[PDB]
Amino acid sequence: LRRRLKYFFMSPCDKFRAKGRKPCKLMLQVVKILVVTVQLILFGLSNQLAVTFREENTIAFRHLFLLGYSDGADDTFAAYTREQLYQAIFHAVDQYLALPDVSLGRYAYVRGGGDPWTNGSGLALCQRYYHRGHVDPANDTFDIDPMVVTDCIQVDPPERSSYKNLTLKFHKLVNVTIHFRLKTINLQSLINNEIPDCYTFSVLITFDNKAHSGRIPISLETQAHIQECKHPSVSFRLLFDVVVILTCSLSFLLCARSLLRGFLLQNEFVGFMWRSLWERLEFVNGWYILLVTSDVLTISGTIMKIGIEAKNLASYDVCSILLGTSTLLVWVGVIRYLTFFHNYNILIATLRVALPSVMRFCCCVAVIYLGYCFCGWIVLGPYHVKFRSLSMVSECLFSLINGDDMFVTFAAMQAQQGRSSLVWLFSQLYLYSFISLFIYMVLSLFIALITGAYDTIKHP
Amino acid sequence: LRRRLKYFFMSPCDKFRAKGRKPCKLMLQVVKILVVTVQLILFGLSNQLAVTFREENTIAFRHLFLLGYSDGADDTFAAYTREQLYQAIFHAVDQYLALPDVSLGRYAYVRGGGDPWTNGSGLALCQRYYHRGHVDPANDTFDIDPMVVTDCIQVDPPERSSYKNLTLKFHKLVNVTIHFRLKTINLQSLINNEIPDCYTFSVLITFDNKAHSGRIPISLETQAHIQECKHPSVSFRLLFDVVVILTCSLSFLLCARSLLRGFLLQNEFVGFMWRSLWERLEFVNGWYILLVTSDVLTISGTIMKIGIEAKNLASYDVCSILLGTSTLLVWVGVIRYLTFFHNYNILIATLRVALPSVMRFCCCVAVIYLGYCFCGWIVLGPYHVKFRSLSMVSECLFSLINGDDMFVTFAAMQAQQGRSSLVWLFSQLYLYSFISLFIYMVLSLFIALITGAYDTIKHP
Amino acid sequence: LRRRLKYFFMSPCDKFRAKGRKPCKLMLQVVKILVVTVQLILFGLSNQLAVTFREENTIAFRHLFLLGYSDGADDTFAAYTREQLYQAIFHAVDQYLALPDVSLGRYAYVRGGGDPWTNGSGLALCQRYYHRGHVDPANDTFDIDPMVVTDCIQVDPPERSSYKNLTLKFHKLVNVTIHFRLKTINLQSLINNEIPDCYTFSVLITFDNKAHSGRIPISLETQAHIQECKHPSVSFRLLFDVVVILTCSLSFLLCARSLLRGFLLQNEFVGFMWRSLWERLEFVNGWYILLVTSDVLTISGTIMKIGIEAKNLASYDVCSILLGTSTLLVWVGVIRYLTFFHNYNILIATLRVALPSVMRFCCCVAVIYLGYCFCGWIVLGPYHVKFRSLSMVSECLFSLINGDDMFVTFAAMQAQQGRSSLVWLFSQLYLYSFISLFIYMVLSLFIALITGAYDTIKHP
Amino acid sequence: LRRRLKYFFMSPCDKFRAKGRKPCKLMLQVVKILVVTVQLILFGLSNQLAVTFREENTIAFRHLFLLGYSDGADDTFAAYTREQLYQAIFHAVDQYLALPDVSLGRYAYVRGGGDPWTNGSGLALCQRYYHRGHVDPANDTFDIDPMVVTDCIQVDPPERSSYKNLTLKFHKLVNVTIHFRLKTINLQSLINNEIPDCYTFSVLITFDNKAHSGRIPISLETQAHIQECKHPSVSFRLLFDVVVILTCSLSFLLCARSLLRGFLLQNEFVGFMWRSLWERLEFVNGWYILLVTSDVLTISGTIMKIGIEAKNLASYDVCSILLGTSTLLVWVGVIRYLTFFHNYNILIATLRVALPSVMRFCCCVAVIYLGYCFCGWIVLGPYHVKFRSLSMVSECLFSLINGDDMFVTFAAMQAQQGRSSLVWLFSQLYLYSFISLFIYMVLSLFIALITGAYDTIKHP
Ligand SMILES: CCCCCCCC(=O)OC[C@H](COP(=O)(O)O[C@@H]1[C@H](O)[C@H](OP(=O)(O)O)[C@@H](O)[C@H](OP(=O)(O)O)[C@H]1O)OC(=O)CCCCCCC
Ligand SMILES: CCCCCCCC(=O)OC[C@H](COP(=O)(O)O[C@@H]1[C@H](O)[C@H](OP(=O)(O)O)[C@@H](O)[C@H](OP(=O)(O)O)[C@H]1O)OC(=O)CCCCCCC
Ligand SMILES: CCCCCCCC(=O)OC[C@H](COP(=O)(O)O[C@@H]1[C@H](O)[C@H](OP(=O)(O)O)[C@@H](O)[C@H](OP(=O)(O)O)[C@H]1O)OC(=O)CCCCCCC
Ligand SMILES: CC(=O)c1ccc2c(c1)CC[C@@H]1[C@@H]2CC[C@]2(C)[C@@H](O)CC[C@@H]12
Ligand SMILES: CCCCCCCCCC
Ligand SMILES: CCCCCCCCCC
Ligand SMILES: CCCCCCCCCC
Ligand SMILES: CCCCCCCCCC
CATH class of the missing domain: 1.10.287 (Helix Hairpins)
Known part of the structure; x- marks a missing residue:
């Protein structure tokens, strides 16, 4: 037991000197660090391009659809008069109808597909206001049913104007929204030797009057849905992912074996001595707990990444968090190698x-x-x-x-x-x-x- | 005496071990921390909404009434020519008269009510200049009586233009002011499930020429008076306040009892030993002094808060300072509990x-x-x-x-x-x-x- | 000797205990700190008003005379085309001629008075260019005599247009300048109960082409000359100054007496012992050296300030530096009092x-x-x-x-x-x-x- | 051997005391510091003027050729509509053709000289687009040959309009570029008493569409080629450079001799003792290694600088890095002198x-x-x-x-x-x-x- 305990708490160099067993786990961990870092770098480089594409399209939309918009004014952009609001709304809709002839990008219209769009409608212009609203600040009186009623006008994209009769209920207005979808192809992908994918941007323009303060903020937001294009005509990404999975699985198995051996030795020592908890957990190698956690995180993140790259998932945040935390942990684990030097x-x-x-x-x-x-x-x-x-x-x-x-x-x-x-x-x-x-x-x-x-x- | 002195300076755990008295004060202090923090959080959440309402209305007023105003230009906004000043003044008055048809908010005019408004007058346009001013920089001569004379034009709001004959005494002008009041209802309150209250904004626009430097700064300021609307048609806030008051009163009574017992023991010890001051005040529990101060501050602030929420007071600053300082002190007092661990x-x-x-x-x-x-x-x-x-x-x-x-x-x-x-x-x-x-x-x-x-x- | 040496290096409290001499110097230093600080505060408050007056007038001049000027653009303000430069120059001159009818300030014209103005002319518009300049970048050739020639047009202020025939020598132009003087009265002084003084602003507008880089920066600068107005019709500032001078003189005399005492005692000790330098200077009280320096600085600065407030000097920088450094030193000297406590x-x-x-x-x-x-x-x-x-x-x-x-x-x-x-x-x-x-x-x-x-x- | 080793590790003062040899190397190093610093200062002052000239010309070009450009907008400057892009391109070309009559600088046209300009052409307007591009986001289909095809229009500068028929292939556009060269003479050199040199600015304006995101950034870049003007008509810079080279060569020779002395003494000591490495390298004077490195860097940088000031090189970055690093090292070497004091x-x-x-x-x-x-x-x-x-x-x-x-x-x-x-x-x-x-x-x-x-x- 004493000999075995001495071997267990022995440094890898001294373990090699004593039993001559090859240090497979150390080399495995070094290779794991390398491959995990490479995977993270490739994933980040791939994702940055999509982020840039979406942001540039959104900036272009802000310049196209928001009347009098200028860069850096998103936080203060707002209307203050009724004619300002009418002009902004009508400018947005007119730009939507004129897009094919003005825009530098190539966009396709989307029709139908459920609410807020009826069938054959590309743009939905909705105003939301209280069901009953009577406000008389002169007499300091008001009678309000806070139930919200929505009235939507549907605009069909042109084939290559009742929305101009819009009448806003200013005193009871809750907000105004414009909803429409645009389809585009991400040609920029060719730079990375990737097949271009098809984006659908859902654009929501909000004129918000929920403060009822005489100032109506105006904002534009986009949500991007990415698919594989159904007829594109222009393998070492999945192979590396499965290589990473295999490396992490081997590391997990070896670390679990080491932890199990440590637990068995702890039990044997406790039984022998009996013939405290802070001294019982001294048999636990915390570095191996960290490595097991990193392996689990990396495997989960790699599965999610494989799903994402196939366009079967869109949970970029969770996958990125998993992989980044795993990379952080594996790089922190390098301190163990330095701990062997005085x-x-x-x-x-x-x-x-x-x-x-x-x-x-x-x-x-x-x-x-x-x-x-x-x-x-x-x-x-x-x-x-x-x-x-x-x-x-x-x-x-x-x-x-x-x-x-x-x-x-x-x-x-x-x-x-x-x-x-x-x-x-x-x-x-x-x-x-x-x-x-x-x-x-x-x-x-x-x-x-x-x-x-x-x-x-x-x-x- | 020695046993009593030993007990007095004994830790709460050891006091419980010795005499068995329940630690009522400690649990009371924990509950006090909880309830005081909850009260402060609710009060701050309530006040932030009113602050936002007032600020948004003031920004809307600046965009409505100040000619050529843009966000971020408050500090440098100024006139430099006579026609600039005339245009700014006339634009402000014209916007006041046109407000019902242009503004996104809903506002009601106020008439009369004392100076500077005559009866039936909504807007007061006043110019203040020296009683006698003769300035001849060519001859380096001047004769000035520094008594200020005020000339005011009264404008009645329209029923749903002598102010255009204004003649400014530029060489002796001290300043120009525009005063008017607007009534509105804070509908946003419904978001917090509160009954909307009635705001009266007193708006003062100042064109300041007290430097006589050729640059006249222009500013807009608002003062908000909040009342309960006289006919509104859309309990667990006062109850929590009285609960807080009762908790703080019980804490104050217990702490005062402890301090009195400490003083009596100090007197007994001094009398016995006689048969210094730095040693005499060692009997004082400073944590209990802090707790008593916090209790007094919290009770005063809670009374002021109850008055404010009833619209019977408008001293937000003093109440906020009292409650915030009390919360700071009660959270600092948590250090005492840590002091019991080595x-x-x-x-x-x-x-x-x-x-x-x-x-x-x-x-x-x-x-x-x-x-x-x-x-x-x-x-x-x-x-x-x-x-x-x-x-x-x-x-x-x-x-x-x-x-x-x-x-x-x-x-x-x-x-x-x-x-x-x-x-x-x-x-x-x-x-x-x-x-x-x-x-x-x-x-x-x-x-x-x-x-x-x-x-x-x-x-x- | 030994008793005298003991007394000399004795603390003020122990000196009082031993010989009973009153601590006149310490009270004098406290009073000196007070009066010097009050003098500095009053001087700074007085000077800030004049600084503000000049700065506001200069900002007004920039807004009046610089075409297309806006706040915050001083560093980048520049012309880039010939017509831009012509428009800027002509706008400046036209504004100079139109000043009485457009400006919010009251200004008087100045004529003659030497270069660059002839007799009876208010504005001087001068262009400076090389004596001979031939530049042929096509052939990579040039022949330049670097002698600068100045051509000036004189404009007389109107009584309540040959400058339009200006022809710029663009290829050899060194710069263009506009010089004129304006008289005004600083009415704002009445706020401080001071008698208004008479300002003459000399305004220089520079269009600089010394880089010959196709970009000509434009700047406006003012120099203010302040006099007492020759017929103004609307003592406890000089009295405090002489009080400060007397206090500092008494402090200087006492400190010099103490330093002489130390030197004599050092000489006596050296002579007695002989019957080093680092030990010989131990008799020097550095705090008294600092006090003497502060006294000299304060007296000089007070004399300069007295001259300035009489409008006999305009050396604000030197006087301000002297008084500020003296105040800094006297406040640093307070450390000596703390030095007496362990x-x-x-x-x-x-x-x-x-x-x-x-x-x-x-x-x-x-x-x-x-x-x-x-x-x-x-x-x-x-x-x-x-x-x-x-x-x-x-x-x-x-x-x-x-x-x-x-x-x-x-x-x-x-x-x-x-x-x-x-x-x-x-x-x-x-x-x-x-x-x-x-x-x-x-x-x-x-x-x-x-x-x-x-x-x-x-x-x- | 012991005496020789004692002398070798002896301080310069003690070496002078022992053997009396003059401290030539120390004075040489002081003079080297002085001359190297002076050379660096003169070089930096000379280079800053050229940097300023180039930057000012580039700013002027941005204001002249970029439609609607303003300072500080370089990072966000971009087009968003087809007519915006057409207007920007046509404005750039029109300003190029109008330069002689509008520009404040003096510029000469350049024709021919190779690609992208044909013979006798001053401006090249080129559009680059994919060889075959079919994009149908409506059907989610695309057929692209990623081969880039370039179509260039040549504009001859006027003698003191087919480019208006430009038709952009928006859906397959990769980018648009405008290339042209302007010759100018740097008259500003006269300020530093230098002969003006002849600059050729190659100007490239890029409208970039490689992201295909509906936003096309616009940028202007310049490259400056500097020559001696072939017929200019208006020695203590090369002499100082050769002086610096001689000083550094003498320092290098002396330091190399000292290092050889150290190596020989080390070998002798090792041979004697034999009758380690960390003790063997104790004979190495690291300060002399640093001095030798600085001498080599300074000589190389001075040769490069001599070539540059003759206009035989344009590698400013390498020369500046060499000289700056050498100056840094020589100033760091001053620490050695302080090391001699305890x-x-x-x-x-x-x-x-x-x-x-x-x-x-x-x-x-x-x-x-x-x-x-x-x-x-x-x-x-x-x-x-x-x-x-x-x-x-x-x-x-x-x-x-x-x-x-x-x-x-x-x-x-x-x-x-x-x-x-x-x-x-x-x-x-x-x-x-x-x-x-x-x-x-x-x-x-x-x-x-x-x-x-x-x-x-x-x-x-
Ligand atoms: C009638 C009025 C009753 C008011 C009850 C108020 C509500 C309630 O639970 O208070 C708990 C407090 C305990 O108060 P509490 O502060 O929790 O308890 C005291 C503290 O532990 C104190 O330590 P420090 O705080 O470190 O100084 C210690 O020295 C005292 O010892 P001692 O016993 O020798 O004085 C304790 O009594 O005890 C009473 O107040 C009287 C007990 C009831 C007597 C009933 C008589 C009919
Ligand atoms: C006639 C001129 C009078 C000028 C009076 C000026 C106004 C006034 O109150 O000064 C107070 C100063 C005291 O001056 P003051 O500096 O307050 O007092 C000295 C300091 O305490 C000094 O310590 P350090 O400062 O630490 O070096 C100490 O060694 C000297 O001891 P000593 O006595 O052995 O020399 C003191 O006399 O004392 C006089 O100046 C003479 C006394 C009057 C003699 C009257 C003769 C007719
Ligand atoms: C012929 C070539 C002459 C080149 C002269 C170059 C210009 C000139 O003044 O150099 C001064 C240097 C002195 O060079 P310098 O470096 O100033 O002097 C040496 C350093 O002080 C060295 O200390 P560290 O620097 O700390 O290692 C020390 O150990 C040497 O002792 P040592 O004497 O036992 O070797 C010194 O000679 O001395 C010569 O170079 C030879 C003397 C003249 C011999 C004349 C023969 C005809
Ligand atoms: C070159 C130049 O303009 C210039 C400006 C300031 C300073 C130096 C050079 C060198 C010494 C520096 C000093 C700034 C303040 C210090 C960093 C002190 O804190 C220690 C050394 C000081
Ligand atoms: C032998 C136990 C050492 C455990 C170290 C774990 C480090 C984790 C850093 C996040
Ligand atoms: C026993 C005396 C301890 C007093 C501590 C008081 C802390 C107050 C912090 C503001
Ligand atoms: C007894 C000598 C002490 C001298 C102290 C001087 C302090 C000067 C600080 C600027
Ligand atoms: C005797 C060896 C000392 C070497 C010092 C070198 C300092 C280099 C700093 C960059």
């Missing part, structure tokens, strides 16, 4: 022994941080753009801790002095106290904890 | 022992900081936008200490080299010396103080 | 003992910094806007050391990848190595020096 | 002993950093502009480590909450974990390493 192991052990106190001090920091977040949100939110939501407040405070965007934060409040002197003085005290406390004391204590851990490692 | 108490005690020297070094830093503030204000203020006011100078220097906005600060001065070589060289020396001194030495000394405190704690 | 003296002595090593390490840092500055200037200057001049390069590197403007610096180079791959790779290596070296090692060594100094102080 | 040697030795552990920890950091880079690139790239490329991701993460651009990074993701909740939550976790880990632990460990090195140096 000079690198000094630094890694310093971090390891520092980690618990760092976590506890993070717990101590969190409550003060949350109190400051709530106070800033409630007090400064009505006045400061960076304090409107709790997550935004947390982001602003975290940036201030790191010395970013400090002066603009102060200046936004400076722009409201004299108006509310009490609020300005409170903001001064709040910001100064928070930043001073966090930079003079908290970061210093983190430094002190790390320094103490390093000293403990260097002078045992 | 590993967290190490960090908290490190901070506690470091605090006095940190405060003394802050005092040492303050005088140097103030000297730099004054010098930079006097020298760089005529040339640098960030140095025009002392508070602005302090904010800029504090941001520089933290590594924010450094390059733009240098570049603003770079943009004036050659013009004033002496000033540019002085700015170079000033900025470089300040930043170098503060980053190489001051922050380092704060780090050293914290590290020494941590070492003292770890090696007693 | 807990503050610990921190001050830590800084004092650290300072020499900090200076030596700054010397070590300077050479590496200069090498990086030169390399970045020569390599990145042709491509990076922030690297065009050596001072700009130094400012950029200093900001990078402190963690400011890093990403924009990287992105400016990113915007030129592919064009010059070698330069982009070099910039990557340069920036990464510089920042890593300075953050990982240099700042850490400064921290280590300060920490070692603090440890030496705490454990003697 | 107080400076303390700091330098601290850095020296810290360097190995710093490098090892950099190796440890690199793998985690790369994992984060890959994960962020794959996950956030589709949504975040700063994450589109791996180098961009690395730059963003490095800036975040230093506290720069943090809030904008958070806000870009905030602008997409609700759309993809999973991606937003992942971005929150990713950013917070990365920044917290790197600021709390990594930088702290660097500080600890430097502090430990300093303590080891101070307490041997």
